[PDB]
Amino acid sequence: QRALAKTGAESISLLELCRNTNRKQAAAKFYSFLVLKKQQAIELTQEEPYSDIIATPGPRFHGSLEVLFQ
Amino acid sequence: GFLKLIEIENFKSYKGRQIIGPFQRFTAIIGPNGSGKSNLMDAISFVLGEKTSNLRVKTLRDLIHGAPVGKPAANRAFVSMVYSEEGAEDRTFARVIVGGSSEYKINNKVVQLHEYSEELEKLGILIKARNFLVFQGAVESIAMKNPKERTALFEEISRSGELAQEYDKRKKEMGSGSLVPRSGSAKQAFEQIKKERFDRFNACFESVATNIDEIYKALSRNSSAQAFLGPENPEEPYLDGINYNCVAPGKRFRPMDNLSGGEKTVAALALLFAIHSYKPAPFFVLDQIDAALDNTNIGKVANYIKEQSTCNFQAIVISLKEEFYTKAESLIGVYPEQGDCVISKVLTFDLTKYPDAN
């Protein structure tokens, strides 16, 4: 019942996630995006080098996404 | 100058045309377990003139995306390097696979392999000595190699090896190989090629040997550290081995082979960077050189690179360790995409926007 209410967004901005993080935390979020993409939990788009990186739901389910997008 | 970016098209797992970079002065390539990082190492080696025999394939066409499952994605593939230098237009070095054969190009004009290699040499990229690229699992061997193999590297870089044939001929004509070697003219002709080979070799060796101690001190950040390069044969250094010995920082002298993997790594990087003081390469590509380093030595190597990447050389590292790669200015992250063959693609991330603190 508590699980049903944990709604999310249509997309996640990596740069927004990394706002007010330090260099190690930001790198770890970037790296997590790579892992989530390998697991097909997300799709990734980056318009141009060094632009924002946008995650959207992938074709595989994934648990604990409210942890990874925090 | 510096490596501004790599452009890759249908090369091993890099399907389609992809921009790799742009690189900063200190960039790390990272990502989860997969083939993409090693394929990017191979792409760099490829465009910088590596032979197909060393790129993990039987035939050149096997480098085209899709060849591992019998269905190549294209009749062609390429890797391209954009080389930038202050006060000059960008120069593009490309190696293209066409018809199962390699075509070389500088600014989209075709050249033969000889001119390609010659032009890279004038930028400090020696495609035979290959002193700008360190492969995964290979960094320690630079410090631990056979002394005679170190001499070979110095003979290649110094071009003293170009004289070895004439040397051997004059030595025999002087009586080498006879029971009792005995002539004023042949002695002079052998003394003359000996001096020429000696002078070429020494111009490289003396430079490296006189800079290695300061570099080894600067890497292990310690006055107690010492590094020595010395020839087994001082009168004819090119004839025998070049000995490499170090005193680890604050520790007591142990004969190198007793050093830890980490200590061997630092000694190997000092040698790598001392070679750079004689014939500087514009960039280094370092594949997992942090594998045996503890966190203290990771900090010291990254600090050396950072203070050196401010226009002495550019550093492109592949790393599995966040302690190392979080010290880079930007990250290139490699990730896979599902397909008939696995596909590699990349993302770019600027770390300089975040404080490296708390």
CA distance B185 to B331: 63
Q: Residue A49: inside a domain, yes or no?
A: yes
Query: In terms of DSSP H, where are the helices of chain B?
Result: 36-47, 113-122, 139-144, 147-158, 164-173, 184-220, 261-278, 295-309, 322-325
What residue spans of chain A are helical by DSSP H?
14-17, 23-38, 65-68
How far is CA B323 from its chain centroid?
23
- Residue span of the structural domain in which A31 resides: 12-68
Q: DSSP secondary structure string, B156-205?
A: HHHSGGGGHHHHHHHHHHTTTTSSS---HHHHHHHHHHHHHHHHHHHHHH
CA B326 to chain centre: 23
Q: Give the C-alpha separation, B231 to B241, whole Å.
A: 6
At residue B358, the 3 state secondary structure works out as coil
Q: How far is CA A46 from CA A33, A65, B185, B333, B347, in A?
A: 12, 21, 72, 12, 7
* Cα B174 to Cα B216: distance, rounded to the nearest angstrom: 42
* A39 in a structural domain: yes
Q: Which residue has the tokens 């020595």?
A: B228
Experimental method: X-ray
Residue A4 lies in a domain: no
* CA B285 to chain centroid: 6
φ, ψ (nearest 5 deg) of residue B155: -70, -35
First-to-last C-alpha distance (Å) of chain A: 21
From residue B150, alpha-carbon distances to B154, B157, B197, B215, B272 in Å are 6, 11, 16, 18, 12
- A18 three-class SS: coil
The angle at the Cα of B167, spanning B164 to B169, to the nearest 5 degrees, equals: 115
Q: How far apart are CA B124 and CA B134, in angstroms?
A: 16
d(CA B7, CA B24): 16
B20 domain residue, yes or no: yes
Residue B157 lies in a domain: no
Distance from CA of A7 to the nearest CA of B (A): 27
Could you write out the three-class secondary structure of B240-281?
Answer: CCEEEEEECCCCCCCCCCCCCHHHHHHHHHHHHHHHHHHCCC
Counting the structural domains of chain A, the total is 1
Distance between terminal CA atoms of chain B? 35
Check CB contact of B32 with chain A, cutoff 8 Å.
yes
Domain CATH number, residue A48: 1.10.10.580
Q: Testing the interface with B: which of A15, A18, A34, A42 to mutate, by most B Cβ within 10 A?
A: A34
Tell me if B139 is assigned to some domain: no
- The DSSP bridge pattern shows strands B133-134 and B26-30 to be unpaired
- Count CA atoms closer than 13 A to A65's CA, side-chain side: 23
Residue B333 near residue A30, CB atoms below 8 Å = yes
DSSP state letter for B1:
-
| Contact call for B335 and A50, based on CB within 8 A | no
What's the angle, vertex CA B157, arms to CA B318 and CA B315, rounded to 5? 20
Question: Can you name the residues that pair with B29 across neighbouring β-strands?
Answer: B318, B332
Contacts of A34 in chain B (CB under 8 A): 30-32, 333-335, 347
Q: Give, in order, the Cα–Cα distances in Å from B143 to each of B126, B179, B256, B269, B273.
A: 20, 39, 8, 8, 12
Residue B355 contacts A, CB cutoff 8 Å: yes
Whether residue B33 is annotated as binding a ligand: the answer is yes
- To the nearest whole angstrom, how far is the Cα of A8 from the nearest Cα of chain B? 24
Query: Has residue B166 been placed in a domain?
Result: no
Any B CB within 8 A of A13 CB: no
User: What is the number of domains present in chain B?
Assistant: 1
Q: Do residues B63 and B57 lie in contact, with contact meaning Cβ atoms separated by under 8 Å?
A: yes
B124: phi then psi, degrees, rounded to nearest 5: 95, 10
C-alpha–C-alpha distance, residues B13 and B15, integer Å: 6
Q: Largest Cα–Cα distance in chain B?
A: 77
Residue B311 dihedral angles phi and psi, to the nearest 5°:
60, 60
Residues of chain A with Cβ-Cβ distance to B358 below 8 Å are 22
Contacts of residue B349, defined as CB under 8 A and 6 or more positions apart, other chains included, come to A14, A26, A27, A30, A50, A53, B330, B331, B332, B333
Tell me how many degrees the CA angle B98-B100-B101 measures, rounded to the nearest 5. Answer: 70
Q: Is A5 a domain residue? A: no
B31 marked as binding residue: yes
Q: Domain containing B349 — which CATH number? A: 3.40.50.300
Cis peptide upstream of residue B32 (ω within 30 degrees of 0): no
Instruction: Let me know if residue A7 belongs to a domain.
Output: no
Domain span at residue B2?
1-132+281-358
**CA–CA separation, A48 vs B347, rounded Å?**
9
Tokens representing B335 are 């990730």
Residue A51 lies in a domain: yes
Is B147 among the domain residues?
Answer: no
Of residues B330, B336, B356, nearest to A38 (C-beta)? B336
Does B21 contact A49 at a Cβ distance shorter than 8 Å? yes
Q: How far apart, in whole angstroms, are the C-alpha atoms of residue A36 and residue A57?
A: 10
- Beta-strand pair B283-287/B133-134: parallel
Q: For residue B43, tell me if it sits in a domain.
A: yes
For residue B230, what are the CA distances in angstroms to B57, B101, B214, B242, B303?
A: 39, 44, 16, 6, 28
Placement of tokens 């599902």 in the chain: B338
Helix (H) or strand (E) segment spanning residue B10: strand B2-11
Residue B322 within a domain: yes
Tell me if chain A has a CB within 8 Å of the CB of B294.
Answer: no
B-chain CB neighbours of A33 within 8 Å are 333, 335, 347
Q: How far apart are CA B191 and CA B188, in angstroms?
A: 5
Length of chain A: 70
